[PDB]
Amino acid sequence: WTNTSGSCKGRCFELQEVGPPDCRCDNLCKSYSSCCHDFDELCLKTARGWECTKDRCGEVRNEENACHCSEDCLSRGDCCTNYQVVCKGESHWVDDDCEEIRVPECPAGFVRPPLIIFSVDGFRASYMKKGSKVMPNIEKLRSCGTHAPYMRPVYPTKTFPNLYTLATGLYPESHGIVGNSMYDPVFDATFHLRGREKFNHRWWGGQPLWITATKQGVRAGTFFWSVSIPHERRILTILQWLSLPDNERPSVYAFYSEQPDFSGHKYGPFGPEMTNPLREIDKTVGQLMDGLKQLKLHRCVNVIFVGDHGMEDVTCDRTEFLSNYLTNVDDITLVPGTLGRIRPKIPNNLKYDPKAIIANLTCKKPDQHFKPYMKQHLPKRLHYANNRRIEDLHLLVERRWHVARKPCFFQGDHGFDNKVNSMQTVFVGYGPTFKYRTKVPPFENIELYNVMCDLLGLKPAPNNGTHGSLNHLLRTNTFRPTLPEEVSRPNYPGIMYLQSDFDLGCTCDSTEERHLLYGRPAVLYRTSYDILYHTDFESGYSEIFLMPLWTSYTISKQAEVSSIPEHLTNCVRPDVRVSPGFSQNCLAYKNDKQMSYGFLFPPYLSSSPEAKYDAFLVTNMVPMYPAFKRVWTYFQRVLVKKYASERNGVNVISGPIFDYNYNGLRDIEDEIKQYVEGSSIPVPTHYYSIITSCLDFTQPADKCDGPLSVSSFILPHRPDNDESCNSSEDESKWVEELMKMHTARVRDIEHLTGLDFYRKTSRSYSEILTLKTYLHTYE
Numbered sequence: 038w039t040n041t042s043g044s045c046k047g048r049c050f051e052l053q054e055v056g057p058p059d060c061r062c063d064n065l066c067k068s069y070s071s072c073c074h075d076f077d078e079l080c081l082k083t084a085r086g087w088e089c090t091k092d093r094c095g096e097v098r099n100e101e102n103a104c105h106c107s108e109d110c111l112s113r114g115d116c117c118t119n120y121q122v123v124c125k126g127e128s129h130w131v132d133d134d135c136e137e138i139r140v141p142e143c144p145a146g147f148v149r150p151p152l153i154i155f156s157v158d159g160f161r162a163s164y165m166k167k168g169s170k171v172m173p174n175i176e177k178l179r180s181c182g183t184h185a186p187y188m189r190p191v192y193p194t195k196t197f198p199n200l201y202t203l204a205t206g207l208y209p210e211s212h213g214i215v216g217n218s219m220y221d222p223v224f225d226a227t228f229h230l231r232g233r234e235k236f237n238h239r240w241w242g243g244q245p246l247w248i249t250a251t252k253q254g255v256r257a258g259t260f261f262w263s264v265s266i267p268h269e270r271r272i273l274t275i276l277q278w279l280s281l282p283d284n285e286r287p288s289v290y291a292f293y294s295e296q297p298d299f300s301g302h303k304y305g306p307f308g309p310e311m312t313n314p315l316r317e318i319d320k321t322v323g324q325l326m327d328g329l330k331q332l333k334l335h336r337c338v339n340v341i342f343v344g345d346h347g348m349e350d351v352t353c354d355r356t357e358f359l360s361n362y363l364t365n366v367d368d369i370t371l372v373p374g375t376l377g378r379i380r381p382k383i384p385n386n387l388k389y390d391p392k393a394i395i396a397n398l399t400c401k402k403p404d405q406h407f408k409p410y411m412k413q414h415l416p417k418r419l420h421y422a423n424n425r426r427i428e429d430l431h432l433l434v435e436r437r438w439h440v441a442r443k444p445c446f447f448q449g450d451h452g453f454d455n456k457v458n459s460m461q462t463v464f465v466g467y468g469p470t471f472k473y474r475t476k477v478p479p480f481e482n483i484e485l486y487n488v489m490c491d492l493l494g495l496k497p498a499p500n501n502g503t504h505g506s507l508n509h510l511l512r513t514n515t516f517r518p519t520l521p522e523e524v525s526r527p528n529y530p531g532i533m534y535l536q537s538d539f540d541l542g543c544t545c546d547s548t549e550e551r552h553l554l555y556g557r558p559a560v561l562y563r564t565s566y567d568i569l570y571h572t573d574f575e576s577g578y579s580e581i582f583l584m585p586l587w588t589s590y591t592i593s594k595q596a597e598v599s600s601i602p603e604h605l606t607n608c609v610r611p612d613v614r615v616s617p618g619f620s621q622n623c624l625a626y627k628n629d630k631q632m633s634y635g636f637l638f639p640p641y642l643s644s645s646p647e648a649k650y651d652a653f654l655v656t657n658m659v660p661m662y663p664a665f666k667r668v669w670t671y672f673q674r675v676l677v678k679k680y681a682s683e684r685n686g687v688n689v690i691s692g693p694i695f696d697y698n699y700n701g702l703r704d705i706e707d708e709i710k711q712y713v714e715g716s717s718i719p720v721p722t723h724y725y726s727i728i729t730s731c732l733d734f735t736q737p738a739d740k741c742d743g744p745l746s747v748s749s750f751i752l753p754h755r756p757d758n759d760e761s762c763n764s765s766e767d768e769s770k771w772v773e774e775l776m777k778m779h780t781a782r783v784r785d786i787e788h789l790t791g792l793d794f795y796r797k798t799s800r801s802y803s804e805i806l807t808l809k810t811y812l813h814t815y816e
């Protein structure tokens with residue numbers, strides 16, 4: 038119970054912990070209905086608006102006013118933000134020319150530059166194009182500070198998952214907020230945007246910035262604001278907090294605006310009606326900077342201007358209905374809109390038939406505007422499966438469309454695949470720790486938690502950022518990364534056997550400098566493997582998993598594609614370097630009527646026939662479904678060369694991935710669940726390829742002087758091509774479309790393989806970390 042009869046005198050927006058039976062005066066009290074009876078009258082003053090006028094300058098201090106224009110207001114830290122402009126002849130911050138802030142210019146008492154996070158909901162990255170005509174203050178922050186052309190949110194591209202990701206550095210599947218709405222089958226309880234269930238701490242995992250700060254003795258302002266508190270009051274409160282005594286003043290602050298998300302939904306992102314909310318936000322930014330300038334803090338504070346996701350054109354007329362596909366939609370619950378999650382209406386309903394539902398949802402209309410996925414089949418880049426709150430059945434909805442259960446106020450929405458252009462949001466950093474007038478490549482919001490920790494002198498809790506990959510955004514306070522140490526050193530075995538030693542059922546009728554350009558990948562777990570050299574490729578062959586962990590080769594721009602001769606079609610030769618006991622056998626493949634096999638280094642690209650024979654080794658062989666082989670062969674035969682021609686050579690590294698429990702991490706042997714029939718050859722869940730070349734395309738891959746260029750993929754190893762609706766046609770009609778959807782970061786592959794790439798290069802380790810987090814989106 039809360040004794041509401043208490044008072045908020047001298048307590049407005051206080052930062053100290055206060056809980057029942059005591060009554061509260063913090064920015065969250067309304068949300069708990071636990072405010073003192075006089076909170077509104079004493080703390081939410083509104084009288085006379087938010088701006089000084091000339092007829093108010095040097096007034097007698099009246100406590101009834103929202104903000105003040107009296108002589109003493111400055112030291113007391115509660116002037117209206119435009120006080121000195123109206124009353125003391127000063128200029129607005131936005132009318133001042135930019136000057137590089139080479140070091141913090143903070144008043145005495147300030148040990149570190151404070152950090153203010155200014156988050157805007159639904160701010161599409163492309164809104165920034167509207168420039169200073171519409172958003173002069175924001176434009177100044179962007180042009181004078183450090184900005185990215187856009188920032189990639191996490192999927193689903195909705196508010197709660199993204200704000201909590203920002204706060205924690207974690208994927209939703211890790212922090213637990215996997216949607217604005219969700220059902221937890223263990224709680225048997227439902228979380229909603231609106232309502233009280235969300236206030237239960239049991240939903241919220243990881244460790245958000247404010248907790249990290251607090252636990253390391255750094256004071257945080259309260260990040261959250263009750264929706265009824267006007268933005269002008271949030272700003273004044275932050276400014277007041279910054280005016281607090283040295284022993285009370287917080288170091289990190291957060292402002293939040295629900296705009297332009299609201300207007301985006303109502304009018305769509307390209308509506309002329311969008312200009313007005315963008316103007317309002319800029320005005321609020323202006324109040325903040327005017328306020329900091331008045332406090333002599335405008336060259337002391339680090340400001341981060343950041344969105345949670347973008348906004349797409351979505352109207353009533355573009356809605357798919359499950360009732361068009363399924364007979365009994367009243368028996369399922371659908372989490373609807375710009376994504377789909379399906380479960381039975383009655384939890385654990387035994388008649389629920391997901392294979393049948395998926396079958397009715399698969400490629401049933403030629404223009405079908407969604408695609409069903411078992412969650413383990415979703416592109417790995419989304420990192421959206423390893424949580425009990427994520428339904429097994431998912432629908433990835435096409436941009437601009439909605440999915441509903443069964444049969445216009447809105448013109449905009451968001452939620453789609455996070456590589457979609459319209460979902461990208463904004464990042465600008467301005468202040469002494471950020472660089473001056475610097476543009477940086479786009480990056481993912483999971484990286485920001487580490488940077489904010491760096492900005493505040495904190496040690497980050499475990500998270501999914503790659504600490505160091507964003508050092509290039511900072512003047513100082515950078516993080517010196519250290520290379521992880523190799524766990525398993527490789528055997529280099531010479532010949533120890535002869536062809537006569539092998540009973541496998543197989544019948545056949547200066548490498549490094551040229552094929553391993555960035556050093557060998559380090560193995561970061563306990564295991565046993567052999568380096569194998571060949572004329573055209575090198576490989577790290579695992580004696581445990583009976584295949585390479587990686588095969589590495591370089592294809593020159595001018596290199597030639599050859600065929601596999603008819604008599605070599607089914608040729609597999611044993612490898613005298615590797616024990617018969619540590620080899621696969623072709624008999625398992627003959628017996629397994631469903632599983633075929635493939636080669637990591639493509640015979641099609643060997644230099645000479647004597648080299649071709651290297652490719653057919655039993656140690657270059659991997660288990661592949663015929664369905665997948667359609668994809669792989671086309672990749673090996675047509676695409677690698679096309680990449681080599683367009684990029685002036687490519688270095689390729691390919692290999693298997695085992696992720697049977699879909700946690701995005703390298704499986705241990707115990708977790709692998711499928712083997713080639715009658716054998717112990719484990720079946721990969723995915724195959725990756727990492728394609729690297731020179732950023733300066735005028736130099737060949739093998740002779741690159743400077744920065745690298747990378748694209749990668751993690752292809753699902755599946756027994757059919759159901760995901761590809763046009764798979765019945767020629768591979769030139771569908772394979773690349775599939776590969777684009779499964780684009781990936783090198784970092785993703787590192788998590789899934791336990792390997793560490795690019796250890797030997799001429800680049801800084803920080804620059805390399807940036808490279809590993811890059812995602813080629815094809816947008």
Ligand SMILES: *[C@@H]1O[C@H](CO)[C@@H](O[C@@H]2O[C@H](CO)[C@@H](O[C@@H]3O[C@H](CO[C@H]4O[C@H](CO)[C@@H](O)[C@H](O[C@H]5O[C@H](CO)[C@@H](O)[C@H](O)[C@@H]5O[C@H]5O[C@H](CO)[C@@H](O)[C@H](O)[C@@H]5O)[C@@H]4O)[C@@H](O)[C@H](O[C@H]4O[C@H](CO)[C@@H](O)[C@H](O)[C@@H]4O)[C@@H]3O)[C@H](O)[C@H]2NC(C)=O)[C@H](O)[C@H]1NC(C)=O
Nearest residue numbers: 210211212213241242243423424425499500501700701788
């Ligand atoms: C992204 O980055 C994150 C953070 O680094 C990584 O996630 C981590 O993964 C590791 C490895 O699996 C996990 O370690 C295991 O920890 C458990 C117990 O850990 C408990 O305490 C810690 C610390 O306080 C909490 O962070 C954990 O919180 C999880 O569970 C709670 C309650 O359900 C939930 O509220 C949180 O959101 C979070 O859930 C997420 O993780 C769990 C798995 O823990 C997952 O089931 C869920 O769906 C969410 O994904 C938790 O309360 C410990 O028992 C394990 O021990 C194992 O190793 C020992 C070795 O001695 C074995 O003997 C034993 O048998 C186990 O195998 C692990 O140490 C860690 O929890 C987890 N952290 C978080 C916050 O998720 C991701 O892997 C990264 N992703 C990628 C792709 O890189």
Ligand SMILES: *[C@@H]1O[C@H](CO)[C@@H](O[C@@H]2O[C@H](CO)[C@@H](O)[C@H](O)[C@H]2NC(C)=O)[C@H](O)[C@H]1NC(C)=O
Nearest residue numbers: 038039040041042043044045058059060073074
């Ligand atoms: C709820 O709040 C009121 C006001 O703070 C409390 O009233 C005070 O109670 C003490 C002790 O009984 C009196 O001596 C004071 O005169 C009261 N103060 C005022 C200004 O009313 C009340 O005690 C609280 N109710 C509880 C504790 O249940």
Ligand SMILES: *[C@@H]1O[C@H](CO)[C@@H](O[C@@H]2O[C@H](CO)[C@@H](O)[C@H](O)[C@H]2NC(C)=O)[C@H](O)[C@H]1NC(C)=O
Nearest residue numbers: 362363364365366390392393394395396397398
């Ligand atoms: C999948 O779609 C088929 C139709 O394509 C559904 O079967 C129809 O509905 C009922 C129940 O099976 C039958 O009486 C009709 O004869 C079927 N119509 C046709 C055209 O065959 C089936 O119900 C759907 N499956 C699910 C799980 O929704």
Ligand SMILES: [Ca+2]
Nearest residue numbers: 696702703704
């Ligand atoms: Ca795994």
Ligand SMILES: [K+]
Nearest residue numbers: 626629630632
């Ligand atoms: K076979």
Ligand code: NA
Nearest residue numbers: 758759761764
């Ligand atoms: Na198909």
Ligand SMILES: [Zn+2]
Nearest residue numbers: 158159196345
């Ligand atoms: Zn949002």
Ligand SMILES: [Zn+2]
Nearest residue numbers: 159298302451
């Ligand atoms: Zn929204």
